[PDB]
Copies of this chain bind each other. A is one copy, B any other.
C-alpha cells in the first residue's frame, strides 16, 4: 500500500498528552524514534507539570502502532500505515479492575516528516488510595513480560532485543550417585544411568524433554541438560471504516498481586482515503522500561518491539 513507504526508514516521533485524573492535571511530552522495519521504538517521556498523578505503566499503552512490524504475508492487513500520512484517530477505554476507567482520544498523524501523536486522557472514578494513584505498580508493563534485554554479538556489533521464553529447559546435577533435578532431590541415580528422555506433565499437555548436552564432573558425578490474551487482538470495523482491538494488561503491583487493565480501542482514519481493512489478527508487544541515569526530572525511557501474526 502507498503511504507505508514513508515507514521504510527511521521516523522521528513526538508524543503530546494532556490528562486530568480525578482532578489531578498533568501533561506528558515524549520524543524519540521508531524503526517500523523491525518494530523498534525508542522513546523518552517527561511529565511537563512535574508531579506525576499516575504511574507510567498505566499510560505506557496509552502513550503509535503504525511502527508495529507486519511481516510480508500480512502486509495487506496493516491498517495503521495505510491510514498515513493523513493519520487516524484512536479511541480507548481502559477499565481498571476494582477501580475506575480511563477514556482517551488520540490523533496519530504526520506533521512534515515527523510522526505526531496527540492525546486527551481522562480518569473518571479512580480511588485516591489505590494501586493506580498510590504508584503501587512495579514499573512493569505486563506480568508475563521479562523486563530484561538480550544482546547477541553479530559481526562486531551487539543487537539488543527483549527477552522471551521460547521453550522449557531443565538441568540435572548428579553428585556421588544422587540426583537433584529442578530444585528437587530424585534420590539415588548414576550419571551414566541418567535417562535420555524426561517427561513433564502440564494440566493439558505432556511435554517430552530430550537430553541436549552432558558433562562429566567426576567418576560418578556430572550435569545434564534437557530441553524442548496478552497480545492485542485486532478485528476490522467496516461500518466505521477502521479497526477495533481488545486486550488485557496485568500490571505487577508491589504486594504480589496484579492490577488488571482492560483495553478496548477503535481506530478510524482521519481523512478520506483507501485504508486496508484487515482480517482478524493480533500484535505481540514486548516492552522494556528504563531510566536515563543523568536525568533528574520525572521521566521514563521506553524500548518497545511489536510484531504481527
Contact = CB atoms under 8 A, between A and B. Distances in A.
Interface of A: 32, 38-39, 42-44, 69, 73, 76, 97-98, 139, 143, 147-155, 158-177, 179, 181-191, 193-214, 216-229, 236, 248, 250, 255-260, 277-280, 284, 286, 288, 290, 292-294, 301, 303, 305, 307
A208 B216 CA distance: 21
Contacts of A165: 168-170, 182
Contact of A170 (B167, B170, B185, B229): B167
A186 B152 contact: yes
Given A163-B182, A168-B228, 11 more contacts: A167-B182, A169-B169, A170-B226, A191-B222, A194-B224, A196-B211, A200-B206, A213-B225, A219-B236, A250-B256, A257-B259
Nearest to A214: B194
The secondary-structure label for the interface of chain A is strand
B280 A174 contact: no
B212 A225 contact: yes
A50 B269 CA distance: 42
Given A172-B223, A221-B174, A97 B204 contact: no
